[PDB]
Symmetry: C2
Subunit: 189 residues, 2 copies
């Protein structure tokens, strides 16, 4: 069955450490706030936000092993940036360890690192909450916060654009889910 809130918080503090656990509470609170604005279920928002980073502190090799063992097919393109995953590994832990069965919550956890095409409202909220939670501080966090409060799709687009430019600037790999997520928003806009 599903773990109690208190059992979950114990598990997250143990696995994530103080700083990342505090981040997670911030994401939770932010997800709940956005849920209020957009009429999303508050408890779906609270649980997905709370547990979204449950696999964050695992080594990439272990993340890959968890995903592979549970039946997910990963390609070389998924393995080469193993950081990214922690969303899928987190979905797996949320389902198999924590006992969370809600499909929307599991998707929101899975795709929070990259986004994807045709995201649910909950998926969007969890994705953006990670960027705008109160504990975050970076150039432009404010416009992003404003946009999230008014026009969620705009906020995601702004985030995707920033990510892609940053990766280009750093010479890193670009994940297809992020590219496809952005295209999908442009085509609906």
């Amino acid at each position: 069955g599903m773990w109690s809130y208190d059992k979950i918080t114990d598990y997250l503090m143990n696995n994530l450490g103080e700083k990342r656990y505090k981040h997670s509470l911030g994401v939770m609170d932010t997800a709940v706030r956005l849920a209020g604005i957009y009429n999303e279920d508050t408890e779906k928002a609270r649980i997905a936000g709370l547990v979204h980073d449950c696999a964050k502190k695992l080594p990439g090799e272990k993340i890959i092993e968890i995903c592979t063992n549970e039946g997910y097919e990963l390609g070389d393109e998924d393995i080469r940036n193993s950081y990214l995953l922690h969303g899928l590994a987190g979905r797996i832990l949320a389902k198999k360890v924590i006992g969370i069965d809600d499909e929307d919550v599991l998707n929101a956890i899975e795709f929070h690192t990259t986004g994807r095409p045709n995201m649910s409202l909950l998926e969007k909220i969890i994705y953006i909450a990670d960027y705008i939670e109160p504990g975050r501080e970076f150039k432009g966090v404010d416009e992003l916060r404003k946009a999230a409060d008014e026009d969620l799709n705009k906020a995601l687009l702004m985030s995707f654009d920033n990510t892609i430019k940053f990766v280009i600037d750093k010479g890193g790999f670009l994940h297809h889910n992020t590219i496809e997520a952005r295209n999908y928003l442009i085509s609906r806009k």
Copy 2:
């Protein structure tokens, strides 16, 4: 059989018009020059460069119809930027109308608009020649020309980066082949 050079030039002038035909001769000459630098076959370079834009002046709807009729499966992601495709339609015309059978030449024509992972030397030469042919003039064309003369992979990477940033800036769609082409170069670098 394959058309004579003179028949090809007649066809290109008629179909492309003066300005775009002149561009094509520039690409041809540039491809030949780069072929000399990199030890690629000069006649493969000359024909691919000459005919690469043979389908450029067709309407997008007709480009799509040519590709579909000849058996290529196009997705919504291919159709939404139909401009791009003219490479595949050009490959089809080069094979079925002009009588060009060389697989490498056909690939170089097909992928000149986007690039792709694991390009041949000829594919790379045709792709970059389009950007650096003498008739071109834009911010940074010079560094691109320098890089092409010394480090072809560097030049492509620079081009892909520029394209992606430009599309983001303009709010357009990003084609998976360009993203995948860039990732492939980063992973070999």
